Amino acid sequence: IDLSRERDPNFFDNPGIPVPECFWFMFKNNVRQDDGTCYSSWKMDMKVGPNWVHIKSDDNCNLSGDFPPGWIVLGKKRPG
Amino acid sequence: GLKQKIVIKVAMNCRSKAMALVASTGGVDSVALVGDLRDKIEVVGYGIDPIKLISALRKKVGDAELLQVSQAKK
Amino acid sequence: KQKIVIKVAMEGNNCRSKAMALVASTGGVDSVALVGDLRDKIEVVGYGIDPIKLISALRKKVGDAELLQVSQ
């Protein structure tokens, strides 16, 4: 999987909270299922196939979490 | 306290009805149609019960699935 | 693609919910957000939104509404 050749998530930055620094992309068997934005150095709960997963982000938007087999959530910084 | 971000997938002019219904919920700051297919609602606010909102969506609009819960950072 | 910002007299009686619901249900709307410290302005973004109709609807159904901004 190569996040250079996946087009941008369709997003909306709420103007009353800070602008989240990361794009994310969710894949089942290396096929894109879903996408959006998230904060760096933070966390979010996401439905990934049948399971809720606590996803932690570091300051470079790398995403760690216990992903069910066949599924991954990958992250990268938005421009700046 | 911190603001919430909730993303809901909805079967969807159901889009207007869904947006109207979520936008009418107490503590909502914003609603946005997100995803390539505009089949997701992103809600930002405070004191939103996502279970209460999914129930209202299912009873008023159609199939609704909670995809994401997270807080605003600062 | 349009951004429209409207000041609404939203004082009391869940006038905010009423006005967010009304704007959220409008044709062409992708996003609606309460903006300003006091959350007393509404930011509407989408395609083919009629800002005249929307202002009319808000004065009819909610309270006084002023166009602060339209941009493209």
Numbering used by the authors:
A (entry chain C): 33 to 112
B (entry chain B): 186 to 197, 201 to 262
C (entry chain A): 188 to 259
Question: What's the publication's text?
Answer:
The rice NLR pair Pik-1/Pik-2 recognizes AVR-Pik effectors from the blast fungus Magnaporthe oryzae, triggering immune responses that limit rice blast infection. The sensor NLR Pik-1 harbours an integrated heavy metal associated (HMA) domain that directly binds AVR-Pik triggering immune responses. Allelic variation in a heavy metal associated (HMA) domain integrated in the receptor Pik-1 confers differential binding to AVR-Pik variants, determining resistance specificity. AVR-Pik is one of the several rice blast effectors characterized to date, and belongs to the Magnaporthe AVRs and ToxB like (MAX) effector family, whose members share a similar overall structural scaffold despite divergent sequence.
